[PDB]
């Protein structure tokens, strides 16, 4: 009764109701949902109450060169702050939340939260571990926390509970409303490889179309792997409609009788792989089918090379015979490993015996420090083999929380290449997630993103979602609650706007404001967690703040006051809704770009790139981060200009928004930084050729790209005349040498980390945007094959492109985007 009560707020929570069973041919997702309750049960049970209840937020990577240097005496100055009264006091780097408390008892048990901010410095960590510490040194800020009572653990609560050859008959298909000839194709696939391929005869393509053809294959029963696909295609030559099946159920049992398969529809792709049925039954395709049954010197050089090579480039069949025959040899290099399980017959059962006898002497792999890039190829559309798969997940269970931040979207999304619901990939993001807040809430968004608007893979993640929220506890359940009570509101309002030339007429500026003074006195809650910042609860809606702003699109800027009075600040929470973006591709490309920022602290390099909040809510919508005292500079253009481009106007708007000439000097440095950082980014991505008016810099001169939604002359990224006038070039400046100094240090750096960029690429472009070709992008960009000194010039030259085209480009860019 209460429990039926619980189930409709999980739904509500989801945007997906898991216990329907209308879109279902087996079992497989409540068997899933089932076998989630055991990993579930076991995280909440094992998490510290005390510590998952203040989530502290911490690395145990070292303090970066650049941070050491803006620390002067080996010491630290934080602000304490009780009521009226605040204190400094000097502290080490090395010194204990806990040790630091008892200095504030002796100098005259209660915990360190951040002002204004739902973040806790505590644990046996010491402080230079702590994120927001190295956030506040990173920007030049003062640490102010205050001393309060930590958090009750109660508000965590959890809601108490054969030599046969193998056939396939063909019965027909039908479509309601479609004199072009069609077939059905039948395919035998284990991750993209193709074992067995069958087709049917070509019969006139009318709404129905029956054949009653049994397709025997050459692949024997036994031969069959656990994780084959029986892959269904309508081509009338051009491919129609899709569907699959897997052959071996999750129960390992062979899948036998009729089957009525809603197929899906074409516009490579994960949405390719899914085992799920289309949910559109009245008008979508659908398909009757019925089922009833030591080594020399010279090879050694040649296999050394295979196992160099990236992840993109092909195995031919000699690399794969060579990997396979000495594959003993190749397990002794971890790096191998995804070329060895390239090289595996899988539609061969004494095969497969030899490469589980294989994997069961891991002594090198399972010793060896976690690679993220050789773990993520494990993980992609390759690999069928749940063993195989398997292996990667183990590596993933040492990374740190804070790691697991960086590559927690791009795991989310590896969960479409599982041929299973329930895989140990899942139960990973399940056990990450319940283990820390912060990982829980991001992970819930995640998910969310997809169920929203992926119909190839809502079933599977909405399982995965109830299974987090029925372990995430009250506290977490609320603060979702009043997270999705919000979005849906506004949402709404945002669609709305839109459907009302370019031009913001005072009529839509009222209607908007009338609407935002409705949804305040209703139904909004007091206050609410900021999705893409968790730390920030916003509060109640600036009404005058607010506007549409004038756009193609026609976007909210909302703006609410913070719900922490304890802020050492009254500045108000931006927030950008829009409809017309697709920002699940916004949030995988900022998600790079933290990934690569890591990257270059390990070189203990500081590029200033800012990846801005963004979430994806649904389809073609979500929320952005509006960045405070920012600005385009197509606006800096048009304020001087008007429509033609001056050199001059952007290092004169430093100056005007700088008090002092050191701030000044500072914001020069910063842009020289963060201009190189987008550079080599944008450039490596594919994503540099952009319009100024996408392009935006702070008051501090931190330039940031934007609007990564969607992406003749040419150019590699935007490096204009009034960029290199900032630097002081015309020529070369000082400056304009530490930005070609800074810019090569840093693509080399990314060159260092080849195979996990080319994954983490191959990845994105397959379960966010295509073809072959556009994935081959970033092995030219990155020049897989050439040396240092041959790839420093490489992008020299790239620099040396921009400026012998100057404004072309970005004049062509203009001329594009006014028809
Ligand atoms: C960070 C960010 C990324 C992004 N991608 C798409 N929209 N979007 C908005 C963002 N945030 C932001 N913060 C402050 C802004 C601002 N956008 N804009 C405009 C808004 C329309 O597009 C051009 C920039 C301003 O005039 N100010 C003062």
């Not at 071996?248 to 398969?261: A, N, P, S, T």
């Not at 595996?344 to 030899?354: H, L, N, R, S």
């Not at 080849?754 to 690429?761: E, G, K, P, V």
Request: proline share 4%; aromatic share 10%; charged share 25%.
């Amino acid at each position: 009764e209460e429990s039926q009560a619980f189930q409709r707020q999980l739904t509500a929570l989801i945007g997906y109701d898991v216990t329907d069973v209308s879109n279902v041919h087996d079992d497989e997702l409540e068997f899933t949902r089932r076998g989630l309750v055991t990993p579930r049960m076991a995280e909440v049970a094992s998490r510290d109450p005390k510590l998952y209840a203040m989530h502290p937020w911490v690395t145990s990577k070292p303090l970066p060169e650049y941070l050491w240097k803006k620390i002067a005496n080996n010491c630290i100055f934080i602000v304490i702050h009780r009521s009226t009264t605040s204190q400094t006091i000097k502290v080490s780097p090395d010194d204990t939340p806990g040790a630091i408390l008892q200095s504030f008892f002796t100098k005259m048990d209660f915990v360190l939260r951040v002002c204004g901010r739902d973040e806790y410095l505590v644990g046996e960590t010491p402080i230079k571990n702590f994120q927001w510490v190295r956030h506040c040194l990173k920007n030049g800020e003062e640490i102010h926390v205050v001393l309060d009572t930590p958090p009750d653990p109660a508000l965590d609560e959890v809601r108490k509970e054969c030599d046969r050859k193998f056939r396939v008959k063909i019965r027909g298909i039908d479509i309601p409303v479609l004199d072009l000839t069609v077939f059905v194709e039948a395919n035998i696939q284990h991750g993209q490889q193709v074992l067995c391929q069958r087709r049917t005869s070509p019969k006139p393509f009318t709404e129905e179309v029956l054949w009653n053809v049994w397709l025997e294959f050459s692949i024997k029963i036994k031969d069959l792997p656990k994780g084959a696909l029986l892959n269904l295609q309508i081509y009338c030559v051009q491919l129609l409609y899709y569907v699959n099946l897997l052959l071996i159920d999750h129960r390992f049992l062979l899948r036998r009788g009729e089957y009525v398969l809603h197929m899906w529809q074409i516009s490579f792709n994960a949405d390719k792989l899914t085992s799920a049925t289309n949910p559109d039954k009245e008008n979508s395709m659908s398909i009757s089918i019925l089922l009833d049954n030591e080594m020399p010197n010279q090879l050694r050089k040649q296999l050394e090379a295979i196992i160099a090579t990236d992840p993109l480039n092909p195995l031919t069949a000699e690399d794969k015979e060579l990997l396979w025959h000495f594959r003993y040899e190749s397990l002794k290099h971890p790096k191998a490993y995804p070329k060895l399980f390239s090289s595996v017959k899988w539609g061969q059962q004494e095969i497969v015996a030899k490469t589980y006898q294989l994997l069961a002497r891991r002594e090198v792999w399972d010793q060896s420090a976690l690679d993220v890039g050789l773990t993520m190829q494990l993980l992609d559309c390759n690999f069928s083999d749940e063993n195989v798969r398997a292996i990667a997940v183990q590596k993933l269970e040492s990374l740190e929380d804070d790691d697991v931040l960086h590559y927690l979207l791009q795991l989310v999304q590896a969960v479409k290449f599982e041929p299973y619901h329930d895989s140990a990939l899942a139960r990973f993001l399940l056990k990450r997630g319940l283990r820390n807040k912060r990982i829980g809430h991001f992970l819930f968004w995640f998910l969310r993103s997809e169920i929203a608007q992926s119909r190839h893979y809502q079933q599977r993640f909405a399982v995965i979602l109830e299974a987090y929220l029925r372990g995430c506890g009250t506290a977490m359940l609320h603060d979702f609650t009043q997270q999705v009570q919000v979005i849906e509101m506004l949402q709404k309002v945002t669609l709305d706007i839109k459907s009302l030339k370019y031009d913001v007429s005072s009529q839509v500026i009222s209607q908007l404001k009338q609407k935002l003074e409705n949804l305040q006195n209703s139904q909004l809650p007091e206050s609410f967690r900021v999705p893409y910042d968790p730390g920030l609860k916003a509060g109640a809606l600036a009404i005058e703040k607010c506007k549409v702003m004038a756009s193609k699109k026609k976007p909210l800027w909302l703006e609410f006051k913070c719900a922490d009075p304890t802020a050492l600040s009254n500045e108000t929470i931006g927030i950008i809704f829009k409809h017309g973006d697709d920002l699940r591709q916004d949030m995988l490309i900022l998600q790079i770009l933290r990934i690569m920022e890591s990257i270059w602290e390990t070189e203990s390099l500081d590029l200033c790139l800012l990846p801005y909040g963004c979430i994806s809510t649904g389809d073609k919508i979500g929320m952005i981060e509006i960045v405070k005292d920012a600005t385009t500079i197509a606006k800096i253009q048009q304020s001087t200009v008007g429509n033609a481009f001056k050199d001059e106007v952007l290092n004169h708007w430093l100056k005007e928004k700088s008090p002092t000439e050191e701030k000044f000097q500072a914001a020069v440095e910063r842009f020289v930084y963060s201009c190189a950082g987008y550079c080599v980014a944008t450039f490596v991505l594919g994503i540099g050729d952009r319009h100024n008016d996408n392009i935006m810099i702070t008051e501090t001169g931190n330039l940031f790209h934007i609007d990564f939604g969607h992406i003749k002359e040419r150019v590699p990224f935007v490096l204009t005349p009034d960029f290199l006038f900032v630097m002081g070039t015309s020529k070369t400046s000082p400056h304009f040498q530490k930005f070609q100094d800074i810019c090569v240090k840093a693509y080399l750096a990314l060159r260092h980390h080849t195979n996990l960029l080319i994954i983490l690429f191959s990845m994105m472009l397959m379960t966010g945007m295509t073809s072959k070709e556009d994935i081959e992008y970033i092995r030219d960009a990155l020049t897989v094959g050439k040396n240092e000194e041959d790839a420093k010039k490489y992008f020299l030259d790239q620099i040396e492109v921009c400026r012998d085209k100057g404004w072309t480009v970005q004049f062509n860019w203009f001329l594009h985007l006014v028809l």
